Design a protein around this ligand. Structure first.
Ligand SMILES: [Zn+2]
Lengths: 217, 97, 124, 245, 51, 62
């Protein structure tokens, strides 16, 4: 009833426009054989409704994972994706989305000895997609804990504001490690959503209906 | 004051033009401003570690020390390794202090 | 509220020729759109107060939980290590370049509008 | 002594014509949902048709759609109500979408009630006030009745015909049963030859019949071949079925 | 009546006072893209206001 | 350290609740607002040539 008024050309609207169009360009549509006109328009609309919304899902996962990754770089906060269940559940749910899409394409029917190892390489990416994010968010924070525990002992044992350069040379290293944490917090969201587009767009291929009759020449 | 506006204008002044890169001189010793903020960062970290160590100093460290001692303690619960021994040593040290 | 061009048409048609050019700024200002003026502030609304109180409550509760965590001084110094990079990002990021670079991500703001080229829609 | 009171109150408090006294304050909602519950009951829809008359002309588009498809599904035709519904559509034609106008035109094609103003305003709404792929989202069993409703009244609107002919394809005809697909191909080809309008997307309606001729009579296949020859001459080419490969 | 006509046209779109009346018919063509680009950029950029 | 959570299903359900809310908020509040201002500009920039030719042909004032 009473929704808020939005300025046109806001910075979040521009940013989310660029983000959504980026993730929508990962699984582009297929250019048909016939030229696109009013004859081919229901076939194009129908192909656009038999394609999964991987653009919307991928920017959903990109936005939630980059916000949970950048929570771990604000003070007094831990990343939610440094939990095993959170990050690994996002990974298993992307893999289950790709599998449910691929199962509903054929029949909801589950598919030599070369193919079960292809299956245990396909069922591993449920584990891999989640725990890459989880171990990347956990390992930098763990190294940060350890190396600032080693960086606190030398101003503990020596004087405060005395013998400065041995603490300066480890505080520069801690600063570089939190900068690497920012880079990893952006790149792992990017890698997760690129891989979600890849895994779901493996099964995002249907039959273009097209014209079954024509008036040629 | 207005509790929305005065500190807003004060922080606008402090952020934008109350710069201690020139009001404390500091061009004569540093090369750029990208080197000043890179050193202001590590200076902020060193000030933070010194302030948070000094604000509660007589404590047994949770972090693994390298077998060193802060000041004239050297055998105290500040320098102990097993935590129950330092726990009871602090329990006897606290009644005297 | 009828449309302002019919207001211009009506307000021009019922004016005598002796007082047409005097009355033209009145019809120009009667049909200029409303840009509402800057009302009095009364700042920090109820949702902004909920946001700032919840943020301070969260920071206090997380700092109570960090300080009793068996690795507690390491957590209190990790807050310093993170706030240092917040301070560093608010000092070397070019914010006008970031504004005009996010503005170029959207095709709506990367260029101006394009229709209605002023020769097709004249009424002579 | 419970069964006596239950048996006397099972048709004293609960009866199929005391619900219609609570169902009069919001009549399009209750009309639509009791029509979807099968409660057709023309002796209660006489009550409904006069219970809504003083407030039809200030209704929403969804309320008018609910009313109109309910009175289609109860097979009741009060023309004094349908002039008010036609006034509501013609006074707010910019606010109706094609999913509502197709249901309203299917109701008015059941009960043959039209005007030139209503036909022009519905054609203006479907062509210009709605999205140009809203016929694609429609399903041909209602676009066929829209073409029939326009060919019955002889209202030639080539803009509406070009818009409605987008909604005929292999996709929108393959979602029909073969009896209903025969119905919509016949009514669409008849209403396309009535106006003399042969768009490029008539070849989908023709090829819906030519790939399966086992459903039609010799007269119906003559009616398909007549429009096939007319559309071959109009579109400037020769018809050809396309095979996969 | 002529002054009222041009008064309405210059109250709605005041940029029209930069193509002179004698020079207007020399700009047209049979297609819209064939219109001479002498005043196209100027009428486009004057119409966007005084800023 | 903290490697397994106290309940794995609670954390997976928190992930599902957060990502489902981000999907709803995207699809409902952001993507209409994205698409209104994107497609006003897009329909104008794609329509401009044919719109101006149609409006040139439709007005009699030349
Ligand atoms: Zn931590």
């Amino acid at each position: 009833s009473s929704v808020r008024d939005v300025k046109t050309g806001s910075l979040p609207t521009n940013f989310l426009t660029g983000v959504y169009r980026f993730w929508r360009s990962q699984n582009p549509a297929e250019k048909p054989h016939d030229p696109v006109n009013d004859r081919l328009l229901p076939a194009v609309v129908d192909a656009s409704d038999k394609r999964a919304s991987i653009g919307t899902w991928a920017t959903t996962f990109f936005c939630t994972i980059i916000s949970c990754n950048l929570l771990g770089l604000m003070p007094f906060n831990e990343a939610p994706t440094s939990g095993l269940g959170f990050a690994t559940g996002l990974g298993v749910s992307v893999w289950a989305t790709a599998t449910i899409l691929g199962l509903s394409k054929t029949g909801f029917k589950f598919p030599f000895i070369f193919v079960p190892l292809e299956t245990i390489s396909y069922t591993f990416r449920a584990v891999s997609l989640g725990v890459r994010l989880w171990v990347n968010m956990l390992a930098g924070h763990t190294l940060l804990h350890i190396l600032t525990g080693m960086a606190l002992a030398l101003p503990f044992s020596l004087g405060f504001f005395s013998m400065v350069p041995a603490t300066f040379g480890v505080c520069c290293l801690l600063s570089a490690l939190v900068g690497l944490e920012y880079l990893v917090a952006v790149l792992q969201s990017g890698v997760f959503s690129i891989l979600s587009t890849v895994y779901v767009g493996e099964f995002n291929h249907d039959k273009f209906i097209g014209p079954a009759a024509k008036i040629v020449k | 004051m207005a509790v929305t506006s005065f500190l807003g204008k004060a922080f606008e002044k402090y952020f934008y033009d109350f710069s201690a890169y020139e009001q404390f001189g500091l061009n004569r010793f540093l090369s750029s401003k990208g080197q000043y903020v890179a050193l202001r960062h590590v200076g902020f970290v060193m000030v933070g570690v010194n302030v948070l160590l000094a604000a509660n100093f007589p404590f047994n460290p949770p972090f693994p020390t390298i077998g060193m001692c802060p000041a004239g303690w050297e055998g105290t619960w500040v320098c102990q390794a097993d935590k129950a021994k330092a726990l009871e040593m602090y329990k006897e040290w606290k009644k005297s202090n | 509220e009828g449309n302002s061009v019919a207001g211009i048409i009506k307000s021009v048609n019922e004016t005598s020729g002796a007082n047409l050019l005097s009355s033209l700024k009145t019809i120009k200002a009667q049909a200029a759109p409303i840009y509402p003026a800057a009302a009095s502030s009364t700042g920090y609304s109820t949702q902004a107060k909920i946001a700032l109180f919840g943020a301070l409550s969260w920071i206090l509760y997380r700092a109570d939980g960090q300080s009793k965590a068996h690795e507690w001084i390491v957590d209190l110094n990790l807050n310093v290590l993170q706030a240092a990079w917040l301070i560093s990002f608010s000092s070397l990021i070019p914010f006008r370049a970031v504004y005009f670079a996010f503005r170029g991500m959207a095709p709506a703001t990367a260029s101006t509008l394009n229709g209605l080229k002023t020769f097709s829609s004249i009424s002579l | 002594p419970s069964q006596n009171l239950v048996s006397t109150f099972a048709n004293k408090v609960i009866v199929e014509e005391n619900l219609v006294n609570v169902a009069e304050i919001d009549v399009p909602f209750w009309s639509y949902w009791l029509s979807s519950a099968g409660f057709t009951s023309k002796d209660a829809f006489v009550k409904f048709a006069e219970a809504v008359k003083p407030k039809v002309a200030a209704l929403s588009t969804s309320d008018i759609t609910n009313l109109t498809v309910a009175f289609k599904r109860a097979n009741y035709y009060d023309k004094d109500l349908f002039t008010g519904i036609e006034a509501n559509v013609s006074a707010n034609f910019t606010k109706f979408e094609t999913e509502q106008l197709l249901q309203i035109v299917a109701t008015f094609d059941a009960f043959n009630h039209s005007s030139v103003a209503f036909l022009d305003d519905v054609a203006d709404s479907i062509t210009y006030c709605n999205h140009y792929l809203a016929p694609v989202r429609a399903g041909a069993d209602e676009l066929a009745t829209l073409l029939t409703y326009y060919a019955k009244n002889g209202h030639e609107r080539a803009d509406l015909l070009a818009t409605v002919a987008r909604g005929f394809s292999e996709v929108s005809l393959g979602k029909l049963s073969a009896a209903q697909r025969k119905d919509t191909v016949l009514s669409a080809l008849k209403a396309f030859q009535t106006f003399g309008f042969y768009p490029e997307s008539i070849e989908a309606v023709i090829g819906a019949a030519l790939v399966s001729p086992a459903e039609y009579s010799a007269e119906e296949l003559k009616e398909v071949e007549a429009v096939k020859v007319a559309a071959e001459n109009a579109l400037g080419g020769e018809f050809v079925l396309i095979q996969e490969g | 009546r002529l002054l009222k006509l041009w008064a309405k046209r210059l109250l709605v779109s005041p940029e029209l006072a930069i193509v002179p009346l004698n020079e207007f018919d020399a700009q047209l063509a049979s297609k819209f893209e064939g219109i001479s680009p002498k005043y196209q950029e100027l009428l486009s950029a004057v119409a966007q206001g005084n800023k | 350290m903290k490697l397994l959570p106290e309940s794995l299903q609670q954390e997976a359900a928190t992930a599902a609740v957060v990502a489902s809310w981000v999907l709803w908020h995207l699809d409902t509040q952001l993507l209409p607002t994205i698409m209104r201002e994107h497609k006003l500009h897009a329909c104008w920039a794609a329509a401009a040539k044919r719109y101006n030719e149609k409006l040139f042909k439709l007005n009699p004032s030349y």
